[PDB]
């Protein structure tokens, strides 16, 4: 990995949760969900 991402293009939307970015809100708001616990209810060890 050498200067893989120097810095080209800015995004008006950034996921404060982790720090992601998007060109539109719909995208960010659609990703933030990943932080809002995205797992199927089913507590069991087995
Ligand atoms: Zn995020």
Swiss-Prot record:
**What assembly does the database describe for this protein?**
Interacts with WT1. Interacts with DEPDC1A.
What does the UniProt entry say about where the protein is found?
A: Nucleus
Q: In which tissues is it expressed?
A: Ubiquitous. Mainly expressed in fetal tissues.
What are the start-end ranges of the zinc fingers (C2H2-type)? 13-35
What's the stated role of this polypeptide? May be involved in transcriptional regulation as a transcriptional repressor. The DEPDC1A-ZNF224 complex may play a critical role in bladder carcinogenesis by repressing the transcription of the A20 gene, leading to transport of NF-KB protein into the nucleus, resulting in suppression of apoptosis of bladder cancer cells.
Query: Which family is annotated?
Result: Belongs to the krueppel C2H2-type zinc-finger protein family.
- Protein name per the record: Zinc finger protein 224
Classification from the root reads:
Eukaryota, Metazoa, Chordata, Craniata, Vertebrata
């Amino acid at each position: 990995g050498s200067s893989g991402s120097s810095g080209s293009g800015e995004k008006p939307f950034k996921c404060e949760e982790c720090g992601k970015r998007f060109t539109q809100n719909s995208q960010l708001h659609s990703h933030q969900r990943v932080h809002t616990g995205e797992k199927p209810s089913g507590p069991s060890s087995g």
